[PDB]
């Protein structure tokens, strides 16, 4: 992976300007797309510990879901190795991207109620924050436009950043305020999570505990273990793309199930 990324075929849009950085979305439109469409959308946030990473990470997935009829995009967001930011700033950027897509839904051919947030590791944390972590919004945006996504698809996310009830210098808030686990509650959007049982960076148990508490609150939170798999197992090019193909087909089925995508 390289940064800056190369996204051939993508329409580039600046979704946020902050400290003289133009943050871009890379948009992959489906065949027969028209502005008047009301398609589901998916916004991918790359991983990289809130420090590095590249939007190119989820370029293959964007091309897949565009091929299936969604408006699929990969968002850039600020990260520590490039910008003077903390985790809470990345959250604000991720929320800005969801808000921007909803705000621009009509020009994007998008149903503002069918916006999916997705990502891997730190990017999976950001996607989770856009469905359940309150506040941390850009202060000058229009908060009457919701930044909350309507579903989530998480690839070994980080969901617990605080040991309360169970890099702190670079969270930018008290740990609970950026910890999805600490905001579990009823009435949340549906989500599916893929995680390797042998993940040595983000322990599988933290995700199992999250999903159990989330089901107890009545939420559709499906955790799919990948037996013996390590961190990053799902990426294109890893293994023999078996896990890559498998997470796509399970994510596809999840989107058809919740009514965001038509069956193949």
UniProtKB/TrEMBL annotation:
EC number: 3.1.1.1
A GO molecular-function annotation: triacylglycerol lipase activity
KW Magnesium (keyword) present: no
Signal peptide: none
Domain BD-FAE-like: 27-213
UniProt keyword annotations, A-Z: Hydrolase
Enzyme class: hydrolase
SUPFAM superfamilies the record matches: alpha/beta-Hydrolases (SSF53474)
Domain of life where this protein originates: Bacteria
Pfam families: BD-FAE
Family: Belongs to the 'GDXG' lipolytic enzyme family.
Protein name (record): Esterase
Species of provenance: Thermogutta terrifontis
Lineage: Bacteria, Pseudomonadati, Planctomycetota, Planctomycetia, Pirellulales
